[PDB]
Amino acid sequence: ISSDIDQLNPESADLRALAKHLYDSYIKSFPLTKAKARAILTGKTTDKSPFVIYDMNSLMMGEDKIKFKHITPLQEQSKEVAIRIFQGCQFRSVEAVQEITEYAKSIPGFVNLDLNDQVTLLKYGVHEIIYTMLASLMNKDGVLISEGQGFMTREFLKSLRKPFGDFMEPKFEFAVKFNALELDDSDLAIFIAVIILSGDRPGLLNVKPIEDIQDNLLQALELQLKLNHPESSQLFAKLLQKMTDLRQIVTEHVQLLQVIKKTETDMSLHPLLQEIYKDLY
Amino acid sequence: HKILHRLLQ
Ligand SMILES: */C(=C(/C#N)C(=O)N[C@@H]1CCC[C@@H]1OCc1cccc(CNC(=O)c2ccc(CN3CCN(C)CC3)cc2)c1)C(C)(C)C
């Protein structure tokens, strides 16, 4: 019963190790850190400034004259302005999944779960995680693109044709509120992990082992936020509510991809994105 | 769900 009455939470030292372990994976796993993205956006960098796309002239100069590491699919370059821009986004999404999946392996005891459970977790998780990481690349003016090489204005994106004009505003709406929390990469590392390990995911065979890890990570994250953001109390709470907004972005995202599947034969969804969106909400 | 469980290997 003295053993039974060890209902207490694990020691901070073990949690900090978990925090650090997760962080390293995160740094290794991903190309762009917030710390990095911020350097570019605030201009505190000797790194080449990024090319601002605010209209068609800018866009065309970018496509024509500026060197980009991330490009619109070569086949798709023939297309209407609104298609190309978005096709290029779609391509960078494909990579993000690979990166994200790699990161999840790093989570202590992710692979020790059932693969029917463990694959489901990613199916629902990835876009929530992508939108979370995208916000590091955004401000009210627009979004960083192609590993910081370009910057594309929010208002330009709203000047695109329907339904693409309204496509990105809900992410911008979210990114300005999320970025107001003033999180950093070490906080984000754990928070991403928390997103993946959810017992609410549909079609999960073994919720109990998952709920136990998430609890582990929520404990880890809560302490990390306590240590890292003393000024903001209930950041843990405020941050956990953003998971709601992430969901809502992702559901609306899919519902707009229905329009795209019905509206254009020439917008072709990648086999992987198609797999993930298949039988999703 | 074939591409995903490939990447989980
Ligand atoms: C990008 C969005 C659109 N439409 C967008 O974000 N779409 C998706 C929403 C959910 C997944 C997709 O985002 C994936 C993603 C992951 C990480 C980083 C990014 C940032 N975007 C880019 O880096 C990027 C890369 C290439 C291009 C194509 N352009 C290259 C420059 N010149 C030649 C013009 C074409 C765009 C963006 C995305 C936009 C709002 C930017 C359209």
Numbering used by the authors:
A (entry chain A): 197 to 477
B (entry chain B): 687 to 695
Question: What's the publication's text?
Answer:
Peroxisome proliferator-activated receptors (PPARs) are ligand-activated transcription factors belonging to the thyroid hormone receptor-like nuclear receptor subfamily 11. PPARs form heterodimers with retinoid X receptors (RXRs), recruit coactivators, and subsequently bind to specific sequences on target genes, termed peroxisome proliferator response elements, thereby regulating transcription. PPARγ is mainly expressed in the adipose tissue, colon, and macrophages and plays important roles in adipocyte differentiation, lipid metabolism, glucose homeostasis, insulin sensitization, and inflammatory action. The ligand-binding pocket (LBP) of PPARγ is a Y-shaped pocket with a volume of 1300–1440 Å3, which is much larger than those of other nuclear receptors.
